[model samples]
Target: GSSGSSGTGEKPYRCAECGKAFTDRSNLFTHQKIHTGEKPSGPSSG
Candidate 1:
């Protein structure tokens, strides 16, 4: 199993505005708050 994989796994999607990465795609979508400046329905943006 010597696969020459030397990169970070793409589990986290990054926020385009804040550069914050989350493991969940949904979380990354939610993390787009700083861009749209939307009132979030989650615990991240209050």
Candidate 2:
């Protein structure tokens, strides 16, 4: 069951540049792209 718990989960992956925590490692990896001048593909930010 993928129940969204009451916020007791651990966010081990932290961004070294911004101190942002993510639930998944892949998310942190994706976030790092921001510091490298690479815009990730997604919905338009308007």
Candidate 3:
């Protein structure tokens, strides 16, 4: 992978579905979950 801190410099990963940019692959994949109507596992205490 290109050298740089996470999500800090040069966003190389992009979402094909929405054209959103990301610095890392994992983040991009995670972002795609929304487009696919998949839920993310996290605190939903709202």
Candidate 4:
């Protein structure tokens, strides 16, 4: 027997900020930084 699925798979991580899914955990980790306001550290505000 064969499955009749064309476009349906499992994702490793899903961002809570949006209804988007990422296959890689690292991909989601980097993406979340945007909504978390995580900067690389700079003196622009000063």
TM-score of 2: 0.54
Report the C-alpha lDDT of model 3 over 1-46, residue by residue, as the tens digit: 7764445455788777777888789999888888889554558763
- Which ten-residue region of model 1 has the weakest summed lDDT? 3-12
Residue-level lDDT for 29 in candidate 1 = 74
Best by lDDT: 3
Clashes of 3: 0
Each candidate structure's TM-score, on Cα atoms with residue i matched to residue i, is: 0.44, 0.54, 0.55, 0.51
Q: Identify the runs in model 1 with alpha carbons over 4 angstroms from their true place.
A: 1-11, 38-46
Candidate 2 per-residue C-alpha lDDT over 1-46 given as tens digits, one digit per residue, 9 for 90 to 100? 9775345655777787777779898898898888878555556763
Error of 4 at 41 (Å): 23
Where's the lowest-lDDT run of ten residues in candidate 3? 1-10
lDDT tens digits, residue span 1-46, model 1: 7663235554446665655657888877776755788654766765
Tell me which residue pairs clash in candidate 4.
Answer: none
Give candidate 2's whole-model lDDT: 0.74
Q: Candidate 4, residue 42: CA error in Å? A: 27
lDDT of 3: 0.75
Which candidate do you rate higher for lDDT, 1 or 4? 4
